[PDB]
């Protein structure tokens, strides 16, 4: 499905997330909201998995898992 990720840093880009979400199955694509007028990575991302099982697994784990000294928040989009 599509899952939303929030509480991203501006030092956390698509590439940093790409390796992070591989133990929860292979991502199809990682879209990340950027605005270059203010900041870099706004704070919201949308990761798109190919399969429904893989997507749900991510939401469960990643929520409570630390990455760059912040608690990532993941939830169904």
């Amino acid at each position: 499905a599509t899952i939303r990720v929030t509480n991203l840093s501006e030092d956390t880009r698509e590439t940093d997330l790409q390796e992070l979400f591989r133990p929860f199955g292979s991502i199809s694509r990682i879209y990340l909201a950027k605005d270059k007028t203010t900041g870099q990575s706004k704070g919201f991302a949308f990761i798109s998995f190919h399969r429904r099982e893989d997507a749900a697994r991510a939401i469960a784990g990643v929520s409570g898992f630390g990455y760059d000294h912040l608690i990532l928040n993941v939830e169904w989009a």
Binding site: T15, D16, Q18, E19, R22, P23
Partner: protein, 142 residues
């Protein structure tokens, strides 16, 4: 020696050999799939990852040197591994989030040299061959 050898004892020999086969360390690790589960090689031969950070390692005695490794999270396997960076003054060209192709060392499944927790070596930096950079056949594109 110490085995049965009658005229009907085929079954007993056949099963006894199978039962004892499992004891051996080299056999057991591979057949229980342990090798895949713990180490990222076994069920792959090469693997590409993204560079997490560049590490300096103040090598454990014997031998006094700074060994210098990179830490890589492999995309396919999803495991974090510290891998040696070979070649002279070649640490330099690695950059955080710049990838590398990692491969096993030579002991296979176990630590090499004077340094524990490293059993893998980098082969390409920037996916364009560390070897080619060291020789100066090819340039660093990144």
């Amino acid at each position: 020696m110490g085995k049965c050898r009658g005229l009907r004892t085929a079954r007993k020999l056949r099963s006894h050999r199978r039962d004892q086969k499992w004891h051996d360390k080299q056999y057991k690790k591979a057949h229980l799939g342990t090798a895949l589960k713990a180490n990222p090689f076994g069920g792959a031969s090469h693997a590409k990852g993204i560079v997490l950070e560049k590490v300096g390692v103040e090598a454990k005695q014997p031998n006094s040197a700074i060994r210098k490794c990179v830490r890589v999270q492999l995309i396919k396997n999803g495991k974090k591994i510290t891998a040696f960076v070979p070649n002279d003054g070649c640490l330099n060209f690695i950059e955080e989030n710049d990838e590398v192709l990692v491969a096993g060392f030579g002991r296979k499944g176990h630590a090499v040299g004077d340094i524990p927790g490293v059993r893998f070596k980098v082969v390409k930096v920037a996916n364009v061959s560390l070897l080619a950079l060291y020789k100066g056949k090819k340039e660093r594109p990144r």
